[PDB]
Amino acid sequence: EQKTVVVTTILESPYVMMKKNHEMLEGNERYEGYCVDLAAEIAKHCGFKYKLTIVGDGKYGARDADTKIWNGMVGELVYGKADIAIAPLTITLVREEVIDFSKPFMSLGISIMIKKPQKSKPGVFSFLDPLAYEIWMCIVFAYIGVSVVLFLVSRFSPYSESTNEFGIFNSLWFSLGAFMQQGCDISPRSLSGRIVGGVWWFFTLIIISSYTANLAAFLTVERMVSPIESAEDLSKQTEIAYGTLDSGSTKEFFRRSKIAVFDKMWTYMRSAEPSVFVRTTAEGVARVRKSKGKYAYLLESTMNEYIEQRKPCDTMKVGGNLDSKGYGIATPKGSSLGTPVNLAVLKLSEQGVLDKLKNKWWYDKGECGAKDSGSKEKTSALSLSNVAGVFYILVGGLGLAMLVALIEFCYKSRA
Amino acid sequence: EQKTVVVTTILESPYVMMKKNHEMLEGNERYEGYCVDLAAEIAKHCGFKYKLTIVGDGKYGARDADTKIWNGMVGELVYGKADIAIAPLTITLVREEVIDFSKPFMSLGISIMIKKPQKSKPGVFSFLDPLAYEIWMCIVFAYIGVSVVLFLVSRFSPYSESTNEFGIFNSLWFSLGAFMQQGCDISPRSLSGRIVGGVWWFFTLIIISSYTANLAAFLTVERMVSPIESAEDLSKQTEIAYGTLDSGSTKEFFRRSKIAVFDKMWTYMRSAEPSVFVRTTAEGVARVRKSKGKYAYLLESTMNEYIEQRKPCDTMKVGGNLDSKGYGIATPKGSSLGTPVNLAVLKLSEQGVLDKLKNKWWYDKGECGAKDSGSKEKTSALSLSNVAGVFYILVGGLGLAMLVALIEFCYKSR
Amino acid sequence: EQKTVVVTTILESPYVMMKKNHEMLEGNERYEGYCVDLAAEIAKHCGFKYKLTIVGDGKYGARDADTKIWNGMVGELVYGKADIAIAPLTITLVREEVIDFSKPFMSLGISIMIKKPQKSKPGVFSFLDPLAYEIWMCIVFAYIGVSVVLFLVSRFSPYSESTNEFGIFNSLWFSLGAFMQQGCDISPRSLSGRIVGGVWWFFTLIIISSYTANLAAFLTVERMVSPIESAEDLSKQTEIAYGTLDSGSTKEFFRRSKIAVFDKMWTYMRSAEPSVFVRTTAEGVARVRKSKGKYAYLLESTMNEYIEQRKPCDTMKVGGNLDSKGYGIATPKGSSLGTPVNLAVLKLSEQGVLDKLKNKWWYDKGECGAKDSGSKEKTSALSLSNVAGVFYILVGGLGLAMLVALIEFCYKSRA
Amino acid sequence: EQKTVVVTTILESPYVMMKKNHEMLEGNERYEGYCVDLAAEIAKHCGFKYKLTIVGDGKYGARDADTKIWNGMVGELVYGKADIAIAPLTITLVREEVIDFSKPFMSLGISIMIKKPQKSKPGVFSFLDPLAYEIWMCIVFAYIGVSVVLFLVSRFSPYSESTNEFGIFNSLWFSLGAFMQQGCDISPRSLSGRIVGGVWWFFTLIIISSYTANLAAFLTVERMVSPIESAEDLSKQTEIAYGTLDSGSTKEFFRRSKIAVFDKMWTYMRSAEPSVFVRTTAEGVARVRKSKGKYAYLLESTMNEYIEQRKPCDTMKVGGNLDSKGYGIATPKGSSLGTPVNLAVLKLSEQGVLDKLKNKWWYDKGECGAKDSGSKEKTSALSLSNVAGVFYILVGGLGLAMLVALIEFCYKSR
Numbered sequence A, C: 001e002q003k004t005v006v007v008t009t010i011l012e013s014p015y016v017m018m019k020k021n022h023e024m025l026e027g028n029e030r031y032e033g034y035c036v037d038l039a040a041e042i043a044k045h046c047g048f049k050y051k052l053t054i055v056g057d058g059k060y061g062a063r064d065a066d067t068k069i070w071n072g073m074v075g076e077l078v079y080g081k082a083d084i085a086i087a088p089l090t091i092t093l094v095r096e097e098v099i100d101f102s103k104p105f106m107s108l109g110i111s112i113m114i115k116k117p118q119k120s121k122p123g124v125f126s127f128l129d130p131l132a133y134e135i136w137m138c139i140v141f142a143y144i145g146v147s148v149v150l151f152l153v154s155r156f157s158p159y160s161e162s163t164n165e166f167g168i169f170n171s172l173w174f175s176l177g178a179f180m181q182q183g184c185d186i187s188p189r190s191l192s193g194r195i196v197g198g199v200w201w202f203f204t205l206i207i208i209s210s211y212t213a214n215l216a217a218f219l220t221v222e223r224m225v226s227p228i229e230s231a232e233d234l235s236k237q238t239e240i241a242y243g244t245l246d247s248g249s250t251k252e253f254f255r256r257s258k259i260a261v262f263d264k265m266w267t268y269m270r271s272a273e274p275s276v277f278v279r280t281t282a283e284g285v286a287r288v289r290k291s292k293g294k295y296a297y298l299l300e301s302t303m304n305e306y307i308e309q310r311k312p313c314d315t316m317k318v319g320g321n322l323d324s325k326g327y328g329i330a331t332p333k334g335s336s337l338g339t340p341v342n343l344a345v346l347k348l349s350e351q352g353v354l355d356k357l358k359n360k361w362w363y364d365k366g367e368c369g370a371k372d373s374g375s376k377e378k379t380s381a382l383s384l385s386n387v388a389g390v391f392y393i394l395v396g397g398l399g400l401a402m403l404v405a406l407i408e409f410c411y412k413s414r415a
Numbered sequence B, D: 001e002q003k004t005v006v007v008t009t010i011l012e013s014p015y016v017m018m019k020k021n022h023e024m025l026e027g028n029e030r031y032e033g034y035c036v037d038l039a040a041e042i043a044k045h046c047g048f049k050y051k052l053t054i055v056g057d058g059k060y061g062a063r064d065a066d067t068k069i070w071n072g073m074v075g076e077l078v079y080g081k082a083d084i085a086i087a088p089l090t091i092t093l094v095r096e097e098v099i100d101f102s103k104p105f106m107s108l109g110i111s112i113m114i115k116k117p118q119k120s121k122p123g124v125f126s127f128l129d130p131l132a133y134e135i136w137m138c139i140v141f142a143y144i145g146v147s148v149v150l151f152l153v154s155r156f157s158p159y160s161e162s163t164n165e166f167g168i169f170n171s172l173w174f175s176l177g178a179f180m181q182q183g184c185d186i187s188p189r190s191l192s193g194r195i196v197g198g199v200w201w202f203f204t205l206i207i208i209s210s211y212t213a214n215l216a217a218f219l220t221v222e223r224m225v226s227p228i229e230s231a232e233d234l235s236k237q238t239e240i241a242y243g244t245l246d247s248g249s250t251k252e253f254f255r256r257s258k259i260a261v262f263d264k265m266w267t268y269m270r271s272a273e274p275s276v277f278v279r280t281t282a283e284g285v286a287r288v289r290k291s292k293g294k295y296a297y298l299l300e301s302t303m304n305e306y307i308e309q310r311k312p313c314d315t316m317k318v319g320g321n322l323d324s325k326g327y328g329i330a331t332p333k334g335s336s337l338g339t340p341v342n343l344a345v346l347k348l349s350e351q352g353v354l355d356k357l358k359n360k361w362w363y364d365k366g367e368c369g370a371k372d373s374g375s376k377e378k379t380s381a382l383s384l385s386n387v388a389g390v391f392y393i394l395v396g397g398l399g400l401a402m403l404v405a406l407i408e409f410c411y412k413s414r
Ligand SMILES: N[C@@H](CCC(=O)O)C(=O)O
Pocket: A060, A088, A089, A090, A244, A245, A248, A249, A250, A251, A298, A299, A300
């Protein structure tokens, strides 16, 4: 052995994660993840020891403005602080000119991530929502007064007061049957009473119509929600905001491309304020979760499709991949080990362990059941929950009437 | 000029804007006069130092009557206190008399701006809206006629008369209960009466279904409708006062205008009470936003559009352009600089840099861009104020209902 | 002297029009219009003899790139067959370099033009349209059958047929009461009759709801028509095609300006086939009038304002002016007439005689001005006409029942 | 001294187009398109002389079985008919090892294409649809319970036998007459009975209002049917058939892909009985359009998005595409032409000129703006089919109703 090769790597799940008790372990053993396995396979096949090292400045890095200095992991490769890079370093021309890459071993595209919109489980009494509290309260008050006036008018000295059935209790019973439009078994005969009947009928006719119309409009508006799709709406949408990782090559791609859609996006991202960019993936996704709908995030599809299956399961992909790129193992210019590394990559590809490792690492952590897949878009049908409440009132009424009849029996058996 | 010039300029947000560090920036670097420094191409060719200098009077300037004294920009040019102006100033013959002008770099016109309309409170009797007056009337006459005809045939000589309930009072009662979809105990029991009952039921079914459908449509889609649209409306104006900027050449234009509609407008604005004119852009803006429903302000369309995208997005252009005029460079008569700089404007129009000059200010600040019907806030509950009218009718009817009973009681007292 | 200067002009209303008796008249009096009047003021100020001449090739003309031979009126002015031109020749830089122009005497803007949307005249029976013919037919049969079956089953012997009131006529009367949801005076007694009643009730309950829902939808859709406004979204609309005059200045404007919306307009004008372009203003207007709704036209606003006020009145302005331009008297390079002509124009402008002409040729010619004022038809409410039909049925029913009572009298009166 | 080369190409409609003067022109003039002007630009940079020819086999063509002797388009290179290929051909290692390939000029991947869905014939019982299934049972059980409780409370010794009319049969009849608003023959005389009578009315009012509202919502903004969410479903179902273009590189990709779903799909298509593979793009299109969506076709998405715009717009992409692959120029081993064109491809790749070509050959050909619903349909009346179901129920009810009377009469025949 000549020397242990110094390897640079940057923390991102599931490529690299801290071990449960890494502070107790050896420097190489401190880490666990996809890249730890791939590095051990390279170490086996190429036959040399290695030292895992975290990137000190913690970013992939790009050309510095107006200085042409390189920072990040790329910086560590060109200024000789380390010998080989095993990390999600993406291949693009502007860095190919100064560092060398192996053959690609994984494929990816750009993706968009948003919060899941809502969980709108209907309330036990949502059916009242069209009319609001005040109207119901005033309807209740009017109900009483109508019966009281009808009764008082109906019973007075004909100066023969017994010649009508409109007692107090019947004077209540009539208004309720009137209000539900169920008709009645009796009719008032006085001029005053006929006036009262007319006006209560008109009141009913207005109210029921207004309620039905408003409810129809309410359900119709919901149908046209039309959520954002295919990333095209973000060309014109402006209530939403979006941004990307800093110093990543997503940013270079957006500011360098000239396709009118992505040119418009870059114009937005360079003019939108305050700064939409974010310095780490973890707090970027935390920013999306906090914004609870208003801020979207752009990221590599591999990472997006890792996250949405994790425990919180509160976010999802939208749209397809916008382009295509690949990952590669990287090494300094003219490093003689680089071609052995390419051979190792080719052999591990042919042996299919690149499949083995991915099938190990992604699906086991996919503990979310992926329920509510969207394969049944409500079928427009009005579910029982939306009106459930109404049955409770009916059942309670019938339950009450039993007790009423029982006390009526106990009365009639002793009065 | 002494190989040096002080370029007359005015702070107007679409064309010249103060930099933040204005306490310490000085010279042209206090601003971003990209609207000028391309026309300074000939200033580059001649190499003379140019200072973008604030116009001393802070205004477009004017020419007095009688004395013909020239104010602000105009004064300082004609008095030789300044030498060249690249200010956003209107081409007009009254100024061509004493100064000369380049080819205009862009064209614009008179525009009119009002406070953006907003939904008002519902009327107490707004529950009537879906059917309009005529139908609400005709229903009544139909009801009367139907009751009378039901009465008549129901009291044909039975062979003894009055062998049925159907008196005129009872006939009105029956027809009223039948319209409202309520339990009516008595029955025609006879061919002509049954015929009358049928059609009346059909009629009431159709009316009710129409009303509910139309209201449902009404509550889904809203349109505020602007109250005015044209200069003709401004000639038929009820209360909304209007006037141009003071010292603005549009005012002189109105004084000059001979066409009968504009002459009537001018004579009104002359005969309107004082403080009908305003002296500054900010004053007009503040007056318009203060004028919830009382005043309207006239300004150039380019400023109107430049404001419309600012915050708050609560003002709007209405109507078309009233005329057309150019904006251009102005200079004292016969200046050795004013002649060749016209070549700059020409060749820059050929280069088409005018498009960049526009975009950099009107479109880079698009900000408050397109809003449309895509998604809406929840319609929310129907408020109590929107149907309140109905309750008053009910309580009024009940309150009335007692009096008839009391008078009946007193009537039968002897 | 002056050798009878020749003036070129192109026929276009209202600038120049044929005299109705031009078949036999001679001289400049053979014409009428704005321009032939204005020629008299030029002759007044210059004091020369002149002749009107019709443009042979009938178009204003353009560079005709790749051959670079001018044509039209401009052709006649540059190749020396025309001494001076007085016509709606607009001033543009590509012309000023070949020919001189005077000071502008009138101002113009470009405008869009469209057909009126035809008014939705109500029908005498428009109220039936929600429910389609076949259902209206079949309801009658269902009614008849139900009534007959109810009668037959009601009056079959219970083991005695006098025990129920459900005679044939009463059986016909029950069902009509039931359909309109207006209750009834009597109820079927037997099990079979109760079954029939329940069935008919369910049927009517479905029908009435379906009718109301459909009608509400039908009205709602009408509201959101949202017709083309400001006409710039013709850059986004594609169902409606639009043309432009050939060899006119408008045809140059869309190639020569380079604002993005006009770029895509010009791209459309390039690609659309059959060609949107047209040879003469009259037949372009004819194209718009016949190809109602789906076709549109671009023209100078002065000409549009002339057209839309004429008696056919079937077309209108839309949107504002796009830019600003003017017309001037024109003359060859170095012609001595040019400056005298400019002085004449200046004098007539200051003397306001330009208006003294214009007023005669537009304000008197307009004879259509009907616009909604004071109140508006379109606002919200249903017209009487929309439900007119219903009142006729009611009136006819009441009118019919009189004759029934009269024949009832005629029967009994000789018993 | 002089030298020329022969080129292979294929008439793929977005990439190469037959010029109308197809009778007698040369291949360097017969054709236009993305491949044609790409080749012209390449020859502009590299300077070499060439002649265009169609691939003589006219197809991609399959590998020779068990020998892999190359197809026409590759053989014309390997067997010296041509020296350079510029065609929509997939980059793959099974080809790269035999011939060299340029840097890819585009990145693309497989997608499904299916027939655009259309309105189906309405179901005979579609009148049920708005109120959902479970509710209908609850209504029935509530009706029964209400009738029983009414009867019991009506008859549990209200003080006794014969004191009231409310038999159990009559109680059920009352319950039914109260729901569907109609004539009420009798009424509860007692408090408990009136309580029972009350709430049922409120319940029926709510139910009816809800149904009629929702149906009206349904008939505006239809937005219906989505038969396939992704090829996942296509792997779960078996009714709709599918397959790739024959000899296509998709077939080789599936032949060796280790993903369980794709391996299942491969084993199925290999095991599929009828002719699932098609030889030409035209065949795949015609087969899909014919099959009314019962067959689905796999292709590279860059064709799919082009065909989508070629009217009629009756085909659509679904799913977010499958994978990523490159298209590039190819060159046989040892050919000197290889690197001097590869450097030109690199030049074009870095200069971005390809974006002009993409605009010229895809986006300038965009026509089908009906995607955005640029025109608004107009509603139509309900057909008899859309409600026909209820009539059968009515007639069946009457038919049943007649039989009871006869059996009753026969029962009372002794
Ligand atoms: N780490 C990626 C970028 C990741 C991202 O921006 O989402 C790169 O090397 O560019």
